[PDB]
Design a protein around this ligand. Sequence first.
Ligand code: G0F
Ligand code: G0F
Lengths: 524, 518
Amino acid sequence: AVDPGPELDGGDFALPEGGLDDDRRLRALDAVDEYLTRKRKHLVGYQATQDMQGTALDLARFMPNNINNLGDPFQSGGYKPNTKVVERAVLDYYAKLWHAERPHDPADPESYWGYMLSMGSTEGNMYALWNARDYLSGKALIQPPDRRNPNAHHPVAFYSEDTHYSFAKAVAVLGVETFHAVGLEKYADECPLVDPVTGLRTWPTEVPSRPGPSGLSWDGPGEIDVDALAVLVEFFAAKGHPVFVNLNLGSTFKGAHDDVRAVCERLLPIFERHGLVQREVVYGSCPQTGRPLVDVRRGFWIHVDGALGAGYAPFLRLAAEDPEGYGWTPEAELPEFDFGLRLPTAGHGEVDMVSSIAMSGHKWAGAPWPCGIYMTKVKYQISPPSQPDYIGAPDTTFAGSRNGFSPLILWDHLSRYSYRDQVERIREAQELAAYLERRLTAMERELGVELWPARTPGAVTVRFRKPSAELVAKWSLSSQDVLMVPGDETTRRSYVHVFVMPSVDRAKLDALLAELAEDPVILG
Amino acid sequence: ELDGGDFALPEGGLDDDRRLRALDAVDEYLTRKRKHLVGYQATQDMQGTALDLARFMPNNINNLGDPFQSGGYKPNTKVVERAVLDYYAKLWHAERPHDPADPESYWGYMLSMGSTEGNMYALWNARDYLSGKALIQPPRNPNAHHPVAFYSEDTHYSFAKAVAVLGVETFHAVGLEKYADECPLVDPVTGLRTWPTEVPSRPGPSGLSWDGPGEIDVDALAVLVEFFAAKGHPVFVNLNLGSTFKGAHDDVRAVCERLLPIFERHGLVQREVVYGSCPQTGRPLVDVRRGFWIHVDGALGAGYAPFLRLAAEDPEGYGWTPEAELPEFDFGLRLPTAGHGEVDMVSSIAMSGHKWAGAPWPCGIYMTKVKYQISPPSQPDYIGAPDTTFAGSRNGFSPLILWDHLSRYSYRDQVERIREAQELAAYLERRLTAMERELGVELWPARTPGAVTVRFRKPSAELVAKWSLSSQDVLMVPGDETTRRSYVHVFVMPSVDRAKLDALLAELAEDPVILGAP
Ligand SMILES: *[C@H](NCCCSC)c1c(COP(=O)(O)O)cnc(C)c1O
Ligand SMILES: *[C@H](NCCCSC)c1c(COP(=O)(O)O)cnc(C)c1O
């Protein structure tokens, strides 16, 4: 019978024609503050860091400015109250962190390009799939054949069943076809995978994730099944389709890390066998006698959805390579995932495997609103829509007006912490997630109750049985239902999770655990 | 100017002195530029909101999911968001409250980008709705599911991006592909029946659109829409309410009056829609929908036009009669049908919060009605809501910014804001023409009646950079590179007062490009 506290009352905020006087205004803002303050100090169920504080002190002075980073980060524009100099410094930091080639240089196809997002990673995943759709479908690139094969400009998208819902939305928005939709449409009877529940060759809706003790993915780690991916990708690559793969680096519910290096090692030979490392691409034509114009491109695009994990994984991997220097050996290996991942081929030399990465600033770093980064390389940049106006190609971003306050937030954050400090943040979170799992299993033994605790090795989240609605509301626990046998509603379990972000300390977890021990749903 | 060296972020971090010196540099730059900005449609003054709202910066606010549903992320401002949406719903004569059971009630949400997101969402929502994809509440023509998009040549570049992103085909692309020799318009320069790339805007003294007002040519739109409607296509029309360069207002009521008879003739008001087919032997489940969608891009103008129209309706009561008439554009626009019923003509509206109101970052509103909401992709999912929003995580600070703003000003104060801007825009245009006579030079001043922007000849790069003047080149004869002209404009936003304009004009009068004459 615990109290989450009162929610905000709509009548306090109704905006009348005549305006509100200063007393009613302050009362309403105080109510918002008291609400937000209580909720932020108890939030443990979402992958969003809640303590910034130094940031507010450093950056409140900028609130009077209508800052607008309209246009490309690397180009001057007319709207002078912008922070593009700060944006570039942040992008440069992450470029180095993710082993991209810097500085950005439009003359160097291998150098990075990216920009800070005005939404969260939803914007970065949309941009990634937009950029990949056009690149793989043969639209024109920024400056510096597909003969016969009718599938050459029909890209197929692959991602695991732990992929965030934003991807399904982005696929629908951009008209990108998933392997499931193309399989059902064109190849209805040819699914190369056997369903482990039914035994039938039915196209799964997403690439299977790895099984747990059950034999099915519901209690698995949440990592993509690399074997199954390879079977699916080979099938579609053999038919002549170009290939888009999204890999999750810190999945939404289980905090899993898809094994990016293993995926790439497994797929590269498939891409080489089916002519997808280098292929000539017809992009339109100009009318005379012979029609098409042609350039050379890769026929695959691997994107890393690092909304969460691109913020901490580089730091964990720093510790893994020098465990003595940082005083910490991480328990789990996190796979190589970034722009430095290169593999040798049979006959194209070393291939740099990853094409893009997104990250959310409001997840690991923390911010007062959604923000983040999309990064790729110059060689992937698409030519924007033409016009009789001139002056570079400033609009090569998803947003038009762009948030120039977000650069400040993340610049301020990154300036305050060294690499060593960032390693300690991921260390403390990893150790606290392990602690939480230990305490939950001890609770089961102390009380004689089932909590179903689960933690993927290397994840900063632990899942367990959903407690009462009031406890869930007090601590902002994110919920997920799973069916333990797909398509059977009698096997439903309700889970919550806790994300151990850097603002979650031992005291917080202990306070949650103590209420959990007396919760009426948990006690049963 | 800001030196990159001062902002580089080393592996080791920056100490407190270095951090502060960098933030001081940013503040000194921004402050100087914000105080002189007059060339973009962005209100620069909101120091009241800084004092009110700085306190919330410690919170990672997230309005994940639908604004009208609870969710698990408790640090959210959805109650505030709804209050802001309700204000604009009333202002735009939408039906409130939002109610999923009332198809005519509004639905909208606050954007995490600017109007780019709202225009993208509108075109996504219209593409799915017009192409027959499944709705939330629904309890032989081969072109029936091929919508065609129409908008003027003054349409913001965000639309061209949105069209590309969503795979929506414009009338130009469909014309070229399917109907290459059948363009119903003649080009005024060539005399050939060439498909124009966008719907013509109205001509100026030149006989061409470059010196026109920037409003869509209603005749031409009607001709083009008729053509594609006759062939069975459903129709999307974007109308600009405060165009980007000229600040023009497309005559939404005139458009609607002109198009409705076309929609009724070709069965687009009530069209049978094949949205799928059942598990039993292939027969369709069918819904009745309209086959047209009119969206108002009010990025700028949806924030002031309701207040100008208030004064127009009661000019004695507000002590002001606006010199130009702004068209009825909103969800209250209803026309009589052939059968003496009524039809509500507008489907959606976008507005930017960082334009007329002002904000520290991009934000805004998308609003439509319950009857147009699309069914999301099917999956047993985690919490936000059965949502239908573009953004995933959503900015929950922007509701506070706009709520704070709206609570400070009555309708009468809002009317005064748009009055002062209209009168100052007229003043600027007078001063520029006086300056041409005083100095004996051509400034090409132009102002669309009713617009809060004035265009003129581009001055020196130094002056442009000091006052953040937005620039645009025009070809005075399309395709001929030798007829290029360089314009700037000034946007008279509420933060632009007479003193600011007089300081600008005094510098313009001594500017070497302006004095350097033809
Ligand atoms: C984010 N999921 C949880 C969002 C709320 S807690 C901050 C997420 C996204 C979408 O990112 P936003 O647009 O930033 O919500 C995309 N991919 C993954 C793996 C995510 O966790
Ligand atoms: C905004 N155009 C001018 C640049 C912004 S100065 C504040 C604009 C858009 C796109 O809106 P944002 O995404 O908010 O830039 C769309 N339509 C029109 C008519 C606009 O003026």
